[PDB]
Amino acid sequence: NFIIPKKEIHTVPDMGKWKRSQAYADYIGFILTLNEGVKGKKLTFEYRVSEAIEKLVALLNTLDRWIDETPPVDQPSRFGNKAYRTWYAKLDEEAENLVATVVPTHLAAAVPEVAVYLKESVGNSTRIDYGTGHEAAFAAFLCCLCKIGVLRVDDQIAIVFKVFNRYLEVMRKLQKTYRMEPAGSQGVWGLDDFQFLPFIWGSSQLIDHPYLEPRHFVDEKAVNENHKDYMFLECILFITEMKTGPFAEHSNQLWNISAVPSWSKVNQGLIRMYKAECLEKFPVIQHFKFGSLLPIHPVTS
Ligand SMILES: [Mg+2]
> Cα-Cα-Cα-Cα dihedral of 18, 7, 129, 206, to 10°?
30
Tell how far the Cα of 179 is from the centroid of ligand 1, in angstroms: 15
3-state secondary structure of 212: coil
Taking the domains of the chain in order of start, what are their residue ranges? 1-190, 191-301
Tell how far the Cα of 133 is from the centroid of ligand 1, in angstroms: 15
User: Which residues make Cβ contacts (< 8 Å) with residue 241, sequence separation at least 6?
Assistant: none
| Resolution of the solved structure (Å) | 1.9
Apex 103 CA angle, 165 and 34, nearest 5: 35
Q: Is 216 annotated as a binding residue?
A: no
Q: Is 80 annotated as a binding residue?
A: no
Q: Is 193 annotated as a binding residue?
A: yes
The CATH fold assigned to 191-301 is Four Helix Bundle (Hemerythrin (Met), subunit A) (1.20.120)
Of the candidates 197, 192, 209, 176, the residue with the CA atom closest to the CA atom of residue 257: 192
| Residue 180 identity (one-letter amino acid) | M
CB crowding 17-29: b at 16 or more within 10 Å, else e: bbeebbbbbbbbe
Of the candidates 254, 249, 250, 130, the residue with the CA atom closest to the CA atom of residue 202: 254
Q: Is 250 annotated as a binding residue?
A: no
Tell how far the Cα of 43 is from the centroid of ligand 1, in angstroms: 25
E strands of 141-186, at which residues?
181-182
Tell how far the Cα of 125 is from the centroid of ligand 1, in angstroms: 21
Tell how far the Cα of 254 is from the centroid of ligand 1, in angstroms: 8
